[PDB]
């Protein structure tokens, strides 16, 4: 793709309002003056070898399509968001009889094209069949009129989508230029406005393919596609000072943003500006970034104390503490690598800082190392069922870390206990401080101990020699909830350098 | 068929249909007592006949009763912000009438949907039919419904026993725009003979001005209808007839 200058082209009629000797300046989607326009060349013969290349060029809020070919090789265009059956697709077809603009939900083929055949008696290339879409569903609009594409000649078309309307402006002027857009000014009258009502993201040119191409032969004997020369530009929202002559034709225009001189013309609303200094605009330096600074978190929630402490409650007597009315920093909690287990089932731990929850709870308890996995949302386990239960729908963090140094020693930690036997599985987030013997059995023993009656609580054995399976791994379950009340505990307000 | 149709679409995907190349008698609509609310924002209900409009759009959908107020230029709400948003500078008239006996049955009528959750605000006069699951923000979720993510379409609860504010109210939003393009559909005001060189009151497709008409040598291109001057007051008009 070789680029060429726009050279003050793409100027069309903004509104269907007559004006005579009026220097009316309006802002509209326009092709910027002196813009470097890509001369796409779709199919280039090698020997006559076919090289099919119809790229999906982006719409970019307007296309200044143009072609200098007098052979009328181009026949219609393709407009669509994704060019599939799901999305509504726009079709333009320019046959000899008329122009067909048809909009439906179209399942396009890999190569959308118009197939023509040569008839010996008629000696003309009539349309054999159309092969662009496989199916036509949810059809919305159709338009038929005299073909503008047919009848040296340079054909210009601006395609715009504004408020569900398709704007097409056509102008035809014969030129002798080989491959460059003329260094001249030509306004574009509104050919037709179409209430398509769909969004167009990419633009694809459609080319007529002859019977020689339609044959599976790699070489088209009767047709050559090397003349497929077309230009594609992109329109930008620039204010323009259009000049209407006595007939209402825009003989000339200036693009305000192109250079300070054109900004001067737009300011004075005159194409000829006398020598001097003119306050065209004001220079404003935009902010590079945003900085937010806020004081230290005075009411810092004591997560450091509760997480890092010497003495904790046991699992059966697990302590529930209310973390509220303070701002809590979970960034230090997440960044800390001291804890072996940092799992937040309800919410992603990474974004725990930004969210604000009305009420936060922390549970302190002690379980064996092998049974750390038992404390999990909707987990069936002895310790999980009996003393500490976690609900299926859980919004909180379960934090565990090695506690060999904190409390494990040669002396057994007989003070800590777990409920080996209980009548029923405990409800989630329920405290179980029970001294009941729980005799149960075939017959209640009614005593401290029995053959079938056992005291619920059994002493932990914590030893350094116990190893990974039996070392403490003291576990903390953090809890979150929302009670349809204003949040009083939340992450610290962000501070930037 | 715009108003007395058997079926009307839900708010999230409403029917926008063209009205053009006709004669429009808004008076028979206005005088009708079926329409409970006839608030015209950019126009007047009585004076709709005099005007002539380039394009007429009829947006029809079924909403709950209390939500009628929030379908208006510049009002916030559930329906207004996630389902159907009118522009702040809206020129048109909203027509609403009770439909409890029509589209609400003895059992729960649940075919009408409103998008309860959406990422952000709705732009004016745009239809979003996306059914992607909405994530609150705490945790990412897949397409399957989750604890934190919900299906965005929510069904209206319509029962005959519901009172005002909980009953379906058909709303037809007639949005009118004057783009200076040739007008297509407008009032039934009878055309009269054209008068030149004499001071007359002229109503050329709703300009409604007073002046003396003289034949002009200025040439108008076929697409464009009327000219303008510095004051942006009409300096030349092409006859409609």
């Amino acid at each position: 793709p070789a680029y060429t200058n726009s050279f003050t082209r793409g100027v069309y009629y903004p509104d269907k309002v007559f004006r005579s000797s009026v220097l009316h300046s309006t802002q509209d989607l326009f092709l910027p003056f002196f813009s470097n326009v890509t001369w796409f060349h779709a199919i280039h013969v090698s020997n006559g070898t076919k090289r099919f290349d119809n790229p999906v060029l982006p719409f970019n809020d307007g296309v200044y399509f143009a072609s200098t070919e007098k052979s009328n090789i181009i026949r219609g265009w393709i407009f669509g968001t994704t060019l599939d059956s799901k999305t509504q697709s726009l079709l333009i077809v320019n046959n000899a009889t008329n122009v067909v603009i048809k909009v439906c939900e179209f399942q396009f083929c890999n190569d959308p094209f118009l197939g023509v055949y040569y008839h010996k008696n008629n000696k003309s290339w009539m349309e054999s069949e159309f092969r662009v879409y496989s199916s036509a569903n949810n059809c919305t609009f159709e338009y038929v009129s005299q073909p503008f594409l047919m009848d040296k000649n340079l054909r210009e078309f601006v395609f715009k989508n504004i408020d569900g309307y398709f704007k097409i402006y056509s102008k035809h002027t014969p030129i002798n230029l080989v491959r460059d857009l003329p260094q001249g000014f030509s306004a574009l009258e509104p050919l037709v406005d179409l209430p398509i009502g769909i969004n167009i993201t990419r633009f694809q040119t459609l080319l007529a393919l002859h019977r020689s191409y339609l044959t599976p032969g790699d070489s088209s004997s009767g047709w050559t596609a090397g003349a497929a020369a077309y230009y594609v530009g992109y329109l930008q929202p620039r204010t323009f000072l259009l000049k209407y002559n006595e007939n209402g034709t825009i003989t000339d225009a200036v693009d305000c943003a192109l250079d300070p001189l054109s900004e001067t013309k737009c300011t004075l609303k005159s194409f000829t500006v006398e020598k001097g200094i003119y306050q065209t605009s004001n220079f404003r330096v935009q902010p590079t970034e945003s900085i937010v600074r806020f004081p230290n978190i005075t009411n810092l929630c004591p997560f450091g104390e509760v997480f890092n402490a010497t003495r904790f409650a046991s699992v059966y007597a697990w302590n529930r503490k209310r973390i509220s009315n303070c701002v809590a920093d979970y960034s230090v909690l997440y960044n800390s690598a001291s804890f072996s287990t940092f799992k937040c089932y309800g919410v992603s731990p990474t974004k725990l800082n930004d969210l604000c929850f009305t009420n936060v709870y922390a549970d302190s308890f002690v379980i064996r190392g092998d049974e750390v996995r038992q404390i999990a949302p909707g987990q069936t386990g002895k310790i999980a069922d009996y003393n500490y239960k976690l609900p299926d729908d859980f919004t909180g963090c379960v934090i565990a870390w090695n506690s060999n140094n904190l409390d494990s020693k040669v002396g057994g930690n007989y003070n800590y206990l777990y409920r080996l036997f209980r009548k029923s599985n405990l409800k989630p987030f329920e405290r179980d401080i029970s001294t009941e013997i729980y005799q149960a059995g075939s017959t209640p023993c009614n005593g401290v101990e029995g053959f079938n009656c056992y005291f619920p609580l059994q002493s932990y054995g914590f030893q350094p020699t116990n190893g990974v399976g039996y070392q403490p791994y003291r576990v903390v379950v953090l809890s979150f909830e929302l009670l349809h009340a204003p949040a009083t505990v939340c992450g610290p307000k962000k501070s930037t350098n | 068929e715009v108003f007395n149709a058997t079926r009307f679409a839900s708010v999230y995907a409403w029917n926008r249909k063209r009205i053009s190349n006709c004669v429009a008698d808004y008076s028979v609509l206005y005088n009708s007592a079926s329409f409970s609310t006839f608030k015209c924002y950019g126009v007047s209900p009585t004076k709709l006949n005099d005007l002539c409009f380039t394009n007429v759009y009829a947006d029809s959908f079924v909403i709950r009763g209390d939500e009628v107020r929030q379908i208006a230029p510049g009002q916030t709400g559930k329906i207004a912000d996630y389902n159907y948003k009118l522009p702040d500078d809206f020129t048109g008239c909203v027509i609403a009438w009770n439909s409890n006996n029509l589209d609400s049955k003895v059992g729960g009528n649940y075919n009408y949907l409103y998008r309860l959750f959406r990422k952000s605000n709705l732009k004016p006069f745009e239809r979003d039919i996306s059914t992607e699951i909405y994530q609150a923000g705490s945790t990412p979720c897949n397409g399957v419904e989750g604890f934190n993510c919900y299906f965005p379409l929510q069904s209206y609860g319509f029962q005959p026993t519901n009172g005002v504010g909980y009953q379906p109210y058909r709303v037809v939003v007639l949005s009118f725009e004057l783009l200076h393009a040739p007008a297509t559909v407008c009032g039934p005001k009878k055309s009269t003979n054209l008068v030149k060189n004499k001071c007359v009151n002229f109503n050329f497709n709703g300009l409604t001005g007073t002046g003396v008409l003289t034949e002009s040598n200025k040439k108008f291109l076929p697409f464009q209808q009327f000219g303008r001057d510095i004051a942006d007051t009409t300096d030349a008009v092409r006859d409609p007839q």
Partner: antibody
Amino acid sequence: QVQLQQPGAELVKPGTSMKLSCKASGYTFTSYWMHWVKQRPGQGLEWIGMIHPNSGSTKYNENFKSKATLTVDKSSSTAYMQFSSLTSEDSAVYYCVRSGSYYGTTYDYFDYWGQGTTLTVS
Amino acid sequence: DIVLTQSPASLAVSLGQRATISCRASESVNIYGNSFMHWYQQKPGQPPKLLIFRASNLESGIPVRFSGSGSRTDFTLTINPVEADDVATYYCHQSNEDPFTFGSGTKLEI
């Protein structure tokens, strides 16, 4: 497990006000929330009122607000409800109700209910 | 207040087959993510038995056959292996506000 005891059936004359309570076993009565409900066959269950046994306020539904007096006894783990101007339509089978919460301050779940006593005025 | 309309009321489903019942409240029972809905197993002349005491929480000691689904006003119950004796009247209840209304009733038969 948790067992709540109710009379099998109660036959009374119209216009009589009486106390109905549930004995609580297997759980601490004070901590858990105390609610009440009545059943009428062929008609939906509809709630009565709320009291927290240890230092808790009381609320009732609007239709039956103050129609029946409701109290809680810390001893015997029983909550006593008293009628007022009992009628045939007021008669229904009443169920002892216990409520539980993950964090408190809300009614997350109802864990156990009693068998219920049938207030038949036949 | 909040009214619950159980749909499709009484339902008949074959043994070991998908069964779906949904009750939609007049206004949503979920406050912020968490939902307050209770589904009950009331046999004739027997106390109601819990199935699902939250949006998706399932009571311990009860078969996992009952499943939780739904959001905001609309909550759906799924029973893929419907069993013989568990069929009875089903109630759904909203715990968000003080009216504390329950469902109408949902008869089930094989």
